[PDB]
Design a binder for this molecule. Structure first.
Ligand SMILES: CC(=O)N[C@H]1[C@H]([C@H](O)[C@H](O)CO)OC(C(=O)O)=C[C@@H]1O
Ligand code: NA
Length: 601
């Protein structure tokens, strides 16, 4: 219907008792009252800041808000106490409300030491406040010893925002709160902490993943539990995993390249949390995060209508500063959104009509071509909307001088639709990888996708590592093969975890999988770190793998984050070798996110 988006501040830094306010948690009580919670930070820091958990209630569906109250009061006088990083969880069967948060004294998350005793001042404790009166008053407990079944778990905190209650399946009624832990190897792991007796007792399931951080769970149309996590190893995306046992244990963790993220919190909720299992509505998810890889800005709502397999719909709600954000579904069918604009804590309301999307995810294959050429690629629209669309159009976004055009056949409820894109690349186009955005426009809303057009590059999927001088595999994944996976987010990194690792020169050699006319190498430096950057280099080629011709090119790369070209007169080769002679500021290691080869495939 009529689009709604409205916003109001609930806490402004410096006003009402605190110089800084952060870390939003938002819920709707069984009453329909809204509760917003967040930290008061007297010293403006995370734990062990002597922080308070605070709370405002709205009893008119979000429009006006009552006084800021204290849920858990920090102690600014020695001995210091801090309570920080709230997450609400409503038990909608009993009505009891929970607010999870840290109890810190001397140590925060990084500094916490092994041990579970409630009074240990060097332990970052796991606390929870329980309300049996709709969030008006609160009792308090430390559950650290209940949720630390591994003595090597020296640290934990509840991921702030909002936990869930399961509605489906053998574990219906389970309360699930996400936590992050630090194990004895010092890896950050995710784990669900859950209660099956309505909050009386809590336990941890099995920890999952490495390079995890604040993570969130949601129940899918089929009762599976989807985990969606911040990556503390800073890939520039979200991490994901799924459980088939109600949160007890998760399958393998993967990087989700549909969801750019700058290492920041986020929220994932059911659009229709009361929809029955397996129903079309049960499959609808909303996601909120900063949709940038390098900054906490471009806050964006995405929608999936297939239990999170695809995210065809997105809309920006905050082009500027946008840090933590947390969604909840309101009784009136609209959505609550509590987030950090930079000046404290702000609350927004929006409806689906504002989002403006259509559940019609679509695919366009990646395609490779030569300068000058024209190719037509197929478009497949999977229509999940249930509605007929007689006049879809496809709008494409490509290089300013490329000829692109597209079209889609009418959409039919429950059916796949065919389309086509025709692309002409002008002669003289620089070899490289080109992202093309595509929008499906309909009177019932829009969906989008991207696809890659490769001009004058060899196919990486035919390549393999012929040799490498050095690679770290023990303390991180710096495999040489990471240069040819088509992902700027994974990288080769020379060995670093032993002191006897070599320094420069470093060397990586690719087998192209067969002989090609080649004329260039494209280097992309590591994206999330700046002290392993190749400077001086040479490139050699070979027909047999053993007799190397060259250097066929040499120079000095810049610090640019974009692919860098090193071109050479065209020749036939089956192998190409990069010799990295130096690092930009004289450091010991090399790291390369991607190597592309210019040539006739
Ligand atoms: C328990 C406390 O540390 N939580 C902090 C959390 C944490 O330090 C980090 O997630 C560790 O990786 O980070 C952030 C952040 O804005 O980045 C805010 C939190 O209040
Ligand atoms: Na890579």
């Amino acid at each position: 219907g009529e689009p709604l988006y409205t916003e109001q501040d609930l806490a402004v830094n410096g006003r009402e008792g605190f110089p800084n306010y952060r870390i939003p948690a938002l819920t709707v009580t069984p009453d329909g009252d809204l509760l917003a919670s967040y930290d008061g930070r007297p010293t403006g820091i995370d734990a062990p800041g002597p922080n308070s958990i605070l709370q405002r209630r709205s009893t008119d569906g979000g429009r006006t808000w009552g006084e800021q109250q204290v849920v858990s009061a920090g102690q600014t006088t020695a001995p210091i106490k801090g309570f920080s990083d709230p997450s609400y969880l409503v038990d909608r069967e009993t009505g009891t409300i929970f607010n999870f948060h840290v109890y810190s004294q001397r140590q925060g998350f990084a500094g916490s030491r092994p041990g579970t005793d409630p009074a240990d001042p060097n332990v970052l404790h796991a606390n929870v406040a329980t309300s049996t009166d709709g969030g008006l008053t609160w009792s308090h407990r430390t559950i650290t010893a209940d949720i630390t079944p591994d003595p090597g778990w020296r640290s934990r905190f509840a991921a702030s925002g909002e936990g869930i209650q399961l509605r489906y399946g053998p574990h219906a009624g389970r309360l699930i709160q996400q936590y992050t832990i630090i194990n004895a190897a010092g890896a950050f792991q995710a784990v669900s902490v859950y209660s099956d007796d309505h909050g009386r007792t809590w336990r941890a399931g099995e920890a999952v993943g490495v390079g995890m951080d604040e993570n969130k769970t949601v129940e899918l149309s089929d009762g599976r539990v989807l985990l969606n996590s911040r990556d503390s190893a800073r890939s520039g995306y979200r991490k994901v995993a799924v459980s088939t046992d109600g949160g007890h244990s998760y399958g393998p963790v993967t990087i989700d390249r549909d969801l750019p993220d700058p290492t920041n919190n986020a929220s994932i909720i059911r659009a229709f949390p009361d929809a029955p299992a397996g129903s079309a509505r049960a499959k609808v998810l909303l996601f909120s995060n900063a949709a940038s890889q390098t900054s906490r800005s471009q806050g964006t709502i995405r929608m999936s209508c297939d239990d999170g397999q695809t995210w065809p719909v997105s809309k920006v709600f905050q082009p500027g500063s946008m840090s933590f954000s947390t969604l909840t579904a309101l009784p009136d069918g609209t959505y609550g959104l509590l987030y950090e604009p930079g000046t404290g804590i702000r609350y927004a309301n929006f409806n689906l009509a504002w989002l403006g999307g259509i559940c019609a995810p679509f695919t366009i294959p990646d395609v490779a071509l030569e300068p000058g050429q024209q190719v037509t690629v197929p478009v497949a629209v999977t229509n999940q909307s249930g509605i007929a669309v007689p006049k879809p159009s496809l709008q494409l976004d490509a290089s300013p001088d490329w000829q692109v055009q597209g079209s889609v056949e009418p959409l039919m409820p429950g059916r796949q639709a065919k389309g086509q894109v025709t692309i002409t690349v002008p002669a003289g186009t620089t070899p490289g990888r080109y992202r093309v955005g595509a929008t499906l426009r309909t009177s019932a809303g829009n969906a989008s996708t991207t696809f890659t057009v490769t001009v004058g590059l060899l196919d990486q999927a035919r390549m393999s590592i012929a040799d490498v001088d050095s690679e770290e595999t023990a303390r991180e994944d710096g495999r040489a093969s990471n240069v040819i996976d088509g992902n700027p987010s994974t990288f080769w990194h020379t060995e670093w975890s032993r002191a006897d690792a070599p320094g420069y020169p470093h060397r990586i050699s690719l087998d192209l999988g067969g002989t090609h006319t080649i004329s260039g190498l494209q280097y992309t430096r590591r994206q999330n770190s700046a002290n392993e950057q190749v400077a001086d280099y040479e490139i050699y080629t070979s027909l047999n793998g053993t007799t190397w011709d060259g250097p066929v090119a040499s120079g000095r790369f810049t610090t640019s984050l974009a692919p860098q070209r090193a071109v050479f007169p065209a020749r036939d080769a089956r192998y190409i070798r990069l010799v990295a002679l130096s690092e930009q500021t004289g450091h010991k290691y090399a790291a390369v996110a991607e190597l592309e080869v210019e040539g006739q495939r």
